[PDB]
Design a protein around this nucleic acid. Structure first.
Ligand SMILES: [Mg+2]
Ligand SMILES: [Mg+2]
Ligand SMILES: [Mg+2]
Ligand SMILES: [Mg+2]
Ligand SMILES: [Mg+2]
Ligand SMILES: [Mg+2]
Ligand SMILES: [Mg+2]
Ligand SMILES: [Mg+2]
Ligand SMILES: [Mg+2]
Ligand SMILES: [Mg+2]
Ligand SMILES: [Mg+2]
Ligand SMILES: [Mg+2]
Ligand SMILES: [Mg+2]
Ligand SMILES: [Mg+2]
Ligand SMILES: [Mg+2]
Ligand SMILES: [Mg+2]
Ligand SMILES: [Mg+2]
Ligand SMILES: [Mg+2]
Ligand SMILES: [Mg+2]
Ligand SMILES: [Mg+2]
Lengths: 205, 129, 80, 14, 155, 82
RNA sequence: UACCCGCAGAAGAAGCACCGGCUAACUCCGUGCCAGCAGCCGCGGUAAUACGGAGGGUGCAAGCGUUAAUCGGAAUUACUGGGCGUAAAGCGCACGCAGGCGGUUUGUUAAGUCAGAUGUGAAAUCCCCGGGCUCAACCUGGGAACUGCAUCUGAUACUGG
RNA sequence: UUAGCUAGUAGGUGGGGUAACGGCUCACCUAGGCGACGAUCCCUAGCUGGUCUGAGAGGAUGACCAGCCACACUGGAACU
């Protein structure tokens, strides 16, 4: 229920940084970032009105690794919840358990942060949840269990995300190897260039 | 024939408003006074006068903006062929609350905005759009 | 106080019994037009005082026969 | 078009 | 500053003594995203010459309309040859839902939250004519208060 | 006859019981009369999961409703805990 | 039994469909209106991204395609919300019962309608806020809803008597 | 492209009958009864809470859950 293809090949198809690696090596020093994968990658393709709903959907789904059967269920919950659909869409995307581990910096990549959730390392309020798709409630505290503190995947990841900026609503503690999910984020707190209305209109037909 | 004189009343208003007529006359009745007096109190028309007792003749003064139709369109809703009735919470709005809906209840003829404080329902007469 | 219907008599040939028709206004479930619906009941007429076309008042009783379930109260207007 | 016409016979669904 | 978008290109022809001579018809709209839409139309031999002539007429024939924070004041009917247009403003955050013809008109005005549905003919050149004419007869709560004459809650 | 019994609802391997009043001729999930309460046997027993109402119980016991032995265990402990 | 401890090593665990337009994705070769393809449009007799194959890609996922069925799209039986001069459609015309409808003023009735209240509309399902099974599906607490029907008390502008 | 249907049929009296009212049954008396607001005839079908579809109004349907009715090789009958 995952994607086992090449990581940056998806960014060669899209042309947007998706935080698929750590950040030590530059994005342009591994591949031509504005070349599509294949025979006619340097040729400019035409983009119809059906594309901008589809290419925006593929950009977001490859970040979180959410398949079509589960992302449609996310649209079923965002429609049922009150308020903005796109703001309720971001609450389900950011409230994923594998995203909370990634934005604190316990994992270097989103694929590594999913394995730390899966292979019995994350405590949620003292309880271990081994699935990456848990909706994280506010005012909870997450931590690393006592057996997983000595692993080198935690030691190498607490310095790379320290170089990058941190989210506002999270409280990262590296000495105790724990974290806190305080509140729900907003639209302006996340990535402004992502247009959530392009994805809703595709599921609106 | 003249079986719906309110529809005949709305016919004479919509014609003279569009054809730049200054004032119109029509045969009066008790129900036509109780509708035109509301439209005078809602800024759609200017004045109404009665003439004659053996032949009651109602008069209406038209209203313009710079020579433009104030009453752009009006729609007869209920009719003798099909009666329309609503409750105190099923009263429809015209242009999402911009236009008014003339509803006659037991407390006289009023609008849907005036029926909220009255809390009644009844017969929809016309959509004053 | 008790359940009470009113209507008119359309048939009075049989003894100790009359046929009273009941009309009612029904909003149509699809179109909404108020339509007269005829309900034909069989009413016990004691002493056979009801004629044709009489506006009459009836009430509910036990079944006295195969078809009768209604009885007489009083005549509102007779032989106009 | 008339509502009173559809009282006698409704719209015939094919 | 202006936001432009091509709608459709349809190759038409003209019959002569020597045979058939083709040409191109293109429908474009422009806008500022703040309630001003100007639509154009062009007729030329070549496709980039065809869309340019539609853009040259698009600077003029540009109208004004009263927006209410990026959506319509009230639902208003649109009528044309065969394009029954029925629009309706929606709540905050619904997004633009419409056909491909109406989406070019609604995006260049800055309109976000509207219901939209077209009945009858599906010709894209006839849908947009009722759409532009459906906005200019759509009126504002301020201008009907200039008719009615009261500074009360209806404003 | 008029009796007080349980009705097993819930998914497989998750027992749960509805406290209703029904007739002996009906099934376990059959035609009841009224709902009285509920019972959770897989409850954590630190929170909600058992709540009845003695007012509706005493209305039917005085009329002659029989009580099953499993239902009467809740009656014998609703006075011990409250 | 769920669950939990401990062990070994990425070792035991990804495919199918599509790629002219609709509709996401392009080249090459073979074939020669033949073979085939195809839901629609229609592709192929010497340059076929449409046939067959290869390279490459796309959409999905322990599922993937196809067929059949129902509604939606279809305002294409149009109450909401369609037409009838010439696109399908105004009987060749007239009289007229039943049915539908009805000027204007006042009084009465309160039938229709409207207001309020009571009883009822089994539970489950759906919706709202929760809780719980590590999560989700699922289960479940209360509320809402079930626009219904019956009766009583009111108001009388409109409709009916 | 089903317009007339119906003699225990419609009503009354009395007797009989069932746990209960009743042409439920019998003798007699009356000639009514039903019906263009679809009687009657033919064909199809368990129904409903609901489910699915749809912005809604509507549309299709009644598997699993629940309520009721009917049936237990075919037909008929009564006992307990
Ligand atoms: Mg022009
Ligand atoms: Mg058409
Ligand atoms: Mg099983
Ligand atoms: Mg394409
Ligand atoms: Mg093939
Ligand atoms: Mg060739
Ligand atoms: Mg799966
Ligand atoms: Mg089929
Ligand atoms: Mg339809
Ligand atoms: Mg048509
Ligand atoms: Mg013709
Ligand atoms: Mg003629
Ligand atoms: Mg229920
Ligand atoms: Mg309940
Ligand atoms: Mg429930
Ligand atoms: Mg949870
Ligand atoms: Mg009157
Ligand atoms: Mg007898
Ligand atoms: Mg059968
Ligand atoms: Mg059953």
């Amino acid at each position: 229920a995952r994607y086992l293809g090449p990581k940056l090949k998806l960014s060669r198809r899209e042309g947007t940084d998706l935080f698929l690696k750590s950040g030590v090596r530059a994005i342009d020093t591994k591949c031509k970032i504005e070349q599509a994968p294949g025979q006619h990658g340097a040729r400019k393709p035409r983009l119809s009105d059906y594309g901008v709903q589809l290419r925006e959907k593929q950009k977001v789904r490859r970040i979180y690794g959410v398949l079509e059967r589960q992302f449609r269920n996310y649209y079923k919950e965002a429609a049922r919840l009150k308020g903005n659909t796109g703001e309720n869409l971001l609450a389900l995307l950011e409230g994923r358990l594998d995203n909370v581990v990634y934005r604190m910096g316990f994992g270097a990549t989103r694929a590594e942060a999913r394995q730390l959730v899966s292979h019995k390392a994350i405590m949620v309020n003292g309880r271990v949840v081994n699935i990456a798709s848990y909706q994280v409630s506010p005012n909870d505290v997450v931590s690393i269990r006592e057996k997983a503190k000595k692993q080198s995947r935690v030691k190498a990841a607490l310095e790379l995300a320290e170089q990058r900026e941190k989210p506002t609503w999270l409280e990262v503690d590296a000495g105790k190897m724990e974290g806190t999910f305080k509140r729900k984020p907003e639209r302006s707190d996340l990535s402004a260039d992502i247009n959530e209305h392009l994805i809703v209109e595709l599921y609106s037909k | 024939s003249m079986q719906d004189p309110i529809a005949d009343m709305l016919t004479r208003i919509r014609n003279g408003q569009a054809a730049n007529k200054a004032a119109v006359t029509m045969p009066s009745s008790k129900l036509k006074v109780a509708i035109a007096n509301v439209l005078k109190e809602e800024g759609f028309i200017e004045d109404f006068k009665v003439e004659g007792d053996t032949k009651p003749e109602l008069e209406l003064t038209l209203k313009y903006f710079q020579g433009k139709a104030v009453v752009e369109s009006i729609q007869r809703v209920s009719r003798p062929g099909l009666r329309i009735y609503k409750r105190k919470d099923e009263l429809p709005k015209v242009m999402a609350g911009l236009g008014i809906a003339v509803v006659s209840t037991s407390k006289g003829v009023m609008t849907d905005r005036a029926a909220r404080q009255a809390g009644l329902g009844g017969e929809i007469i016309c959509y004053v759009a | 106080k008790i359940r009470t219907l009113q209507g008119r008599v359309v048939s009075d040939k049989m003894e100790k019994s009359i046929v009273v028709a009941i009309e009612r206004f029904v909003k149509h479930p699809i179109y909404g037009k108020f339509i007269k619906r005829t309900t034909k009941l069989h009413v016990h007429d004691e002493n056979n005082e009801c004629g044709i076309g009489d506006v009459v008042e009836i009430r509910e009783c036990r079944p006295l026969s195969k078809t009768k379930s209604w009885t007489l109260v009083r005549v509102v207007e007779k032989a106009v | 078009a008339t509502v009173n016409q559809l009282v006698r016979k409704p719209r015939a669904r094919k | 500053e202006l936001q432009e978008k091509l709608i459709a290109v349809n190759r038409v022809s003209k019959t002569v003594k020597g045979g058939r001579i083709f040409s191109f018809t293109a429908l474009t709209v422009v806008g500022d995203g703040n309630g001003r839409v100007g639509f154009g139309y062009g007729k030329a031999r070549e496709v980039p010459a065809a869309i340019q002539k539609a853009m040259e007429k698009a600077r003029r024939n540009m109208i004004n309309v009263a927006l209410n924070n990026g959506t319509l004041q009230h639902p208003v009917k649109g009528v044309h040859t065969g394009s029954r247009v029925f629009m309706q403003p929606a709540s905050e955050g619904t997004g633009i839902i419409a056909g491909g013809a109406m989406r070019a008109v609604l995006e260049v005005a800055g309109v976000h939250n509207v219901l939209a549905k077209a009945y009858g003919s599906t010709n894209p050149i006839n849908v947009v004519r009722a759409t532009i004419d459906g906005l200019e007869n759509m009126n504002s709560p301020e201008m009907v208060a200039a008719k009615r004459g009261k500074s009360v809650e209806e404003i | 006859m008029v009796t007080i019994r349980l009705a097993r609802h819930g998914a497989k391997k998750r027992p749960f019981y509805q406290v209703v009043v029904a007739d002996s001729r009906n099934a376990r999930n059959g035609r009841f009369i009224e709902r009285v309460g509920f019972f959770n046997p897989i409850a954590s027993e630190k929170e909600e999961g058992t709540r009845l109402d003695l007012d509706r119980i005493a209305h039917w016991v005085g009329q002659g409703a029989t009580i099953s032995d499993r239902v009467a265990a809740l009656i014998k402990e609703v006075n011990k805990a409250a």
